[PDB]
Design a binder for this molecule. Sequence first.
Ligand SMILES: Nc1ncnc2c1ncn2[C@@H]1O[C@H](COP(=O)(O)OP(=O)(O)O)[C@@H](O)[C@H]1O
Ligand SMILES: [Mg+2]
Lengths: 226, 464, 591, 590, 49, 51
Amino acid sequence: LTTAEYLAYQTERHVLTILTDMSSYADALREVSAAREEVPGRRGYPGYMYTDLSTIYERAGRVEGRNGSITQIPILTMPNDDITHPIPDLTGYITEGQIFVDRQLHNKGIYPPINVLPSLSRLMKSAIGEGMTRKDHGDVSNQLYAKYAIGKDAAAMKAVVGEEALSIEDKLSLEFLEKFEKTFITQGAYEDRTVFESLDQAWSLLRIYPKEMLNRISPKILDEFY
Amino acid sequence: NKKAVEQGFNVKPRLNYNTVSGVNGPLVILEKVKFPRYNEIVNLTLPDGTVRQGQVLEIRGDRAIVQVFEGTSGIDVKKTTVEFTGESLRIPVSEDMLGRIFDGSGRPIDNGPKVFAEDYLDINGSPINPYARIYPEEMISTGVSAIDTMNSIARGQKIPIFSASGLPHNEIAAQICRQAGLVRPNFSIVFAAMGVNLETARFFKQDFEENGSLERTSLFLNLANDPTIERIITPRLALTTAEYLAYQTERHVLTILTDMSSYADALREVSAAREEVPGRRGYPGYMYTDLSTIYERAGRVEGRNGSITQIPILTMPNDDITHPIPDLTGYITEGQIFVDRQLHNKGIYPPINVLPSLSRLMKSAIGEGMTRKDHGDVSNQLYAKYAIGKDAAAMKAVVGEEALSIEDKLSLEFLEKFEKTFITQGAYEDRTVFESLDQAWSLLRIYPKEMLNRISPKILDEFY
Amino acid sequence: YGAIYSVSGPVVIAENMIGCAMYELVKVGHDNLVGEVIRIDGDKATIQVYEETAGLTVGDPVLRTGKPLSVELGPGLMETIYDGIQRPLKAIKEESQSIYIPRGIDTPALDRTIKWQFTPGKFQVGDHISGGDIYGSVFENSLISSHKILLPPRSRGTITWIAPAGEYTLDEKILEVEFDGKKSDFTLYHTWPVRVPRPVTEKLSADYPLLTGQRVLDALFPCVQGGTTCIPGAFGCGKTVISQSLSKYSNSDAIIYVGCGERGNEMAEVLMEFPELYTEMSGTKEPIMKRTTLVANTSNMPVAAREASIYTGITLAEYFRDQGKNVSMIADSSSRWAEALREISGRLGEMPADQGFPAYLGAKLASFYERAGKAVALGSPDRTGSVSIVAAVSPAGGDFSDPVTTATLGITQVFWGLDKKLAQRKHFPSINTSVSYSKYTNVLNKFYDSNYPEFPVLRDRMKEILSNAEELEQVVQLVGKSALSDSDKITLDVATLIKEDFLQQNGYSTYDAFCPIWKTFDMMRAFISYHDEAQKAVANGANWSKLADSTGDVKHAVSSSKFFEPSRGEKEVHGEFEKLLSTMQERFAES
Amino acid sequence: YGAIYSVSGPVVIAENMIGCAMYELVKVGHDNLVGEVIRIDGDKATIQVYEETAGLTVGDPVLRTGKPLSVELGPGLMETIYDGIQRPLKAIKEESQSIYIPRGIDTPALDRTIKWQFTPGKFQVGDHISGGDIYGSVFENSLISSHKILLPPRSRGTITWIAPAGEYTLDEKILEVEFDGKKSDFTLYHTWPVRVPRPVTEKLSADYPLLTGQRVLDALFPCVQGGTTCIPGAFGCGKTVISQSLSKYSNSDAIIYVGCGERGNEMAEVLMEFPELYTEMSGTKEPIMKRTTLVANTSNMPVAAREASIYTGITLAEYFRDQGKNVSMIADSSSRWAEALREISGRLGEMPADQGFPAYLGAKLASFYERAGKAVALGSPDRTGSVSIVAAVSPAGGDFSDPVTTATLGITQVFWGLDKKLAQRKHFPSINTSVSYSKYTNVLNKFYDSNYPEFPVLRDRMKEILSNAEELEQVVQLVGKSALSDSDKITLDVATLIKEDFLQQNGYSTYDAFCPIWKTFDMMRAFISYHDEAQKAVANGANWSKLADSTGDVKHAVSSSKFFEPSRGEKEVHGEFEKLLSTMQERFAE
Amino acid sequence: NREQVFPTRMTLGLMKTKLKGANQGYSLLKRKSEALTKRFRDITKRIDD
Amino acid sequence: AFIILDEVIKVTNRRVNAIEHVIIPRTENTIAYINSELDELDREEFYRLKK
Ligand SMILES: Nc1ncnc2c1ncn2[C@@H]1O[C@H](COP(=O)(O)OP(=O)(O)O)[C@@H](O)[C@H]1O
Ligand SMILES: [Mg+2]
């Protein structure tokens, strides 16, 4: 990260720091802390693990005088696919978002197995839409998230209390979830989907629903794009 | 001839320490010790004249932490004199033990004389050399169909009985002792009671008397009112007696370690008294090591005609096999016999659930020569069809009997006629392995020859 | 020579011991118990003694050996059994005339009375020789022939003198190296510290598969020669018989069977069975025991010696990798190694971390599994050995949430998750197809395209069938099997067929003891073709119930494909499977 | 006397305590607060003060009593009310004239101001005397006369002086025993370590039944004199009825009741109800308090007292057993005793094992329950006594989640399974016979073959009838009621009659207040005879509706079996049952 | 025999809520089945007539 | 109406049995396992704090 800070602030480059196994780094912290017989946090990790992880993660962003940036994507191994674990928790706290890779999706064979429900990006609302990418980006993303959540909940309800409980909207959400995991999320490596192409595919996914049932889409965008 | 006893004629005076620095819990921190041994068993004398034995667990510089088996109540720092024996805990073993009753600490409660020691062996023993081991390939026909056909006990096996508080685990192990015999031609049982109640101890003693076994059994009774710390050493004493008998006197010893759940409870209490790791469910992190030092004393060795077969009776705290005691015992031992409450409430005796049970020494001791050639295939097919019966029973309870297929209905019929006829025996009915295999083949003949997919074609053609 | 100060279980703090290094080996007590320094608090040096500690008094001497725990490498180990500290158990028994392990016995790791037939290598007098260079070969046994005598790593220089061909023991000099004017004398053996991995020129991406012999392991979740593996599961799941059936029937040129916290009866079974087993490698039927050395640490042996057993076994595997043999080290329980580490840590008073396992457990496990890998040996001539670590984790309670299981899953590449539900009902191997994975599936595509091109497609189809049937069964257990379509009926039926005939492989029957790759491939072809034929015939319009009643003959022929003995040969078995497919299409065509 | 060194909460460290013993009671402070010694480190000894430790300075004297937590055993125990520490609540109230218990109140646990009649035993001057030997007798009460004075179990030696017959207090000497010197002198009372069980020569197997007086508890799930039972003990279930029954109608010649942490308003209920009890005897009606000792112990009490309440109660029961008397020790709120034990363990800092409970909870419970049982008492004469423990398992009634509940159900052999649903449904004594069990029927088979031979067979028959009734009720819930066969309908009707008349006992009612064992056996025989006659009539092919119409008179006659008052007793009521049994056959035959 | 859910304080509460909801659904569905079965016997009698 | 009501009763009873024999037992077992794991974590935290 000090190499990245150099390259990005003193040489004005755009850096993409790809720290991997921050879980391994925090395990090293726990080993160091355990040798010092300090007061531990959750699961034995040092109480100052939030401070150390903040010191590492907060070394990303753009400064005024400089024309360079540090984009940080710290790969992180959830020890048991648990967000509640201290390492993923505190990281969520410091970082501004996450890309949640799902073991269930990987078992289903979806690549990339990104589960979009726990995934988040705090800077989407600023970097997306209003001429930055396209007028429909934010509304389409909101509608996709809403329909994916409805599909997951309705699939659970159909598995538990049968298909009778699921209404027409719930059946449509199940079909959308199938066609969404299978055709939208699924993307082989080396395949560059431009944001515009991805938005067109997302609209094709959203056309499964009637115009009325699309809730989060603004009326103007819905009329202009459906 | 025997030069080991030549060193016996030696007197070793013992230092009497009045320097009890402190006492806390089951431990006494005793200072000013002259070269403390790590595992010396000391004779601690209370001010009231009572003598409690204790063994040092940790030794700093001129300081030994003694844990006393009877407990530290009444111990004082001014008056309690501690007499270091200078050696680890050694049980006086002899062939005269067979037929006697001993307390939890090895003292005789049989109202007879103290053991005329033939040798003094350390209770902790030593690990048997794996190169010196012999794999137990001699099957025991315990007379129980569930334990002889489904599972199979070879002679030096460690095969516990996993049960709950109210199940007839004592009755089943008593049935095994009174019926155990080599399948293709006597056992000198050694019984270890740890924390059991007087009813259980009297039941086992009277069962041995009735079957005529007491002439060749040594009983180590540590009742529920006996000190809890000595539940640790009771199985060590019983297993050291068993090791002596078997490996030196050339005897075949059954070892019944009743309430290894109580042994593990005493172990957890002692561990929690100290500042030790909690492992799982509070049990010490070394509970695997301790239970292994207990269990793995069984087996057969090369060059000696003796063997030790262990049947540690284990009480499952909540009828779950994922509890630390049953899990670690299953990891260590070479199988388990699973007594089921779901069958005991159904009225079956013995209420042995076959699916959770296991015998790691069935591959060996099952074959064309040791037993009938069909034994392994029949056992595997019975396991498969019993599981299909359980699944069919669950599916029947869910979606009614009509939705079940022909195979599912056949499997439910097999389940009924298996639990009610194969598993079920009288308390004193011993079934030869061939008898139980004939019954098993009838239960398989319930099925068509095509559905018996576990049986090898030659066996199926020669036995169906 | 220090003195013992504090003794508490396996740890022994020794006073008056200034100058002791970390992880050095000390001879604690009068019996010279092997120990290892863990801490140095001033003059105190906490020592984990690798033997039973009972009987140690305060003031007992503690000799400083000056060298770390060093496993003694050389010709001799091939067919031996060791005690974690590399004490030959056979020699211990012969020397002590007892059935127990004596405390502090100091038998040599490699037998010195045996005379070895040394044949000099390409290196001559004056040739510069570096670490790992093969300066000679010795015939060990009929199976491990030309046991290459490697120059010790970290040792370099010019050959001043090399012994000619003849018969030598391990004590005799074999070669003399002059480096910086200091002559160094080399023998048939050399000691290497277990903690430091043996160096290699360059580790490579493993491409050739480690053929386990089990159908499910070979097909669904393969492991490459040089890949870290993991077999979590409860007791009775079969993680020891999988290890044994992988040490018997794999294509590995050598086996390092390590037992940490295992029953002594298991190692006794290995000793009784491996000599009676034979392998077709080297062009002759040589006993398996001629290529497998055992590191036996029974579960009641000293706790601290389990780490020593793990490290000794992995260093033996690395040595044979350096010789160039595709070795696979089989740790019986990394879980019991972790439990030993936890016991030592708790005795030390260290901070509990997760479940009491010390916070460095994940790091130590990661390092031990990183010892594996296909690698080009350090010295010339060029050779590419491999160490395929397949360690059977044993999580407490049969739950894969244990810290040791999670760390092992993080570090390894193949996860052979065992389900106790399938361990019961005698469905072995009990591999849980849902949770199990193998990350070498993609890298094995080269081998599969070379040998069995359709094998990955068939395994993908089998995985799809099994997953579809799992979903359909989850549906059926709640909503009954009546609402299913005929295609769903076919899926469930063929998946039950797969689980009951193909995936399940009895490891003690003559036919399915070792199911080789060609028989496994033919069996996958049979099952997938049966499923495809049923699907096509029902799509044509046939009712599935009547179709199954008619084609029960073909279904039973497929279900009886297990019994085709691999001993009949590759050609004879393939001929029987070719006729099976022909007899399958005709019967489905007729109905 | 030592001195205080450090006080941080109830734990107190006392410097200058050389010669102090572990688990020894000491008098802490100038108010003489009583506390046990937890651990010793050289001179300093760690003390848990039982009362509140506020106001304890440094240097306050710490006297050493020299004995562990002891129990005052002797005459004057019977009618008194105690706590876990065994401090007389009545005497404390009379001494302090206040509704509170002052800190460090030292009223003797046995009344030293009462003159006790004493009659010397067979042991004369010069005769050897050992532990437990009855060397005298004391007339204490009407129900419990001849309070047999025992030599302390540890004491031994040769008699030198014995007190002549007369009136004595507990303070003044009674016996002088010489053992290598006259180091022993004995009064009417003696002290026993509470944790240490009182020794016996031999602990027999409990064979005789404990007739609680209730038909269900005495027939379906019997207990043996010396057996350990288990009761859910939840509120609104009839545990009060069970306690009163065991107090006044049981075979036990003495009762020890321990609260060990029950609520205050509850303690008020029991302390106001038991003195109002009256057990009819051969002479006349006299209070059941004349034979019952109440160890009253509320939540406000010290946690050490709450943890030692059951131990004091079982030690009192062991003492009364050592006199050859059969004792029933009703342990209310064993779960609250376990909660007190957990609180003490947490205070000491010991690691938890299961649900926060200490690692030794199971061992402590097992030892406590093993302290029960029939046993021939120590010392001559060869009298035999028994202690039976009835333990209210948990306010969390029968919940296997609680480690204390699991341990109690695993150790005790009889579980009487009260049901709140049946209590709401006006079922008394609210026993849920489906979950209730007894493991003492196998050992009681001997007594039944000796006295009432058919009893095990008829009990098993009724258990089978109840199981078949549950199955038939499930069938009639699943499908139509008329779908059941004639045999199923007969089984359901007979079981309904059994529940309405035999099982349902009106304790408050005068006729069925106390059903004797012979009356229960006769009613059970009559019910089984009626069921067998109905089954035979069904096998004959007769319509069940017509059979019921014809045998309504027999049904009323057998239902009147409850209304037959056992006041006449023995053959007077047994002869009536013979006519009722005969009428159940002649009418059925016609 | 149990759901493969990662243990958590929030997860325990969510699963207790799920158990309460399942019990409520089971009771209401049993009531619905009983009412519909009563109507079913009525309809069968009407069909016979 | 009879046929439709029979189908609805069949599916309703199937759902009732499915709940009472799978959903309730699985959820109860999950509750027990989660509570046991939370107790284990609390015990680990207690032991760490005791150290
Ligand atoms: N593939 C298999 N073929 C035949 N038997 C098996 C197989 N897997 C397991 N078993 C049976 O299960 C028993 C226990 O398996 P084991 O190897 O001990 O697993 P673990 O070490 O995990 O308990 C063995 O004795 C064996 O009889
Ligand atoms: Mg194993």
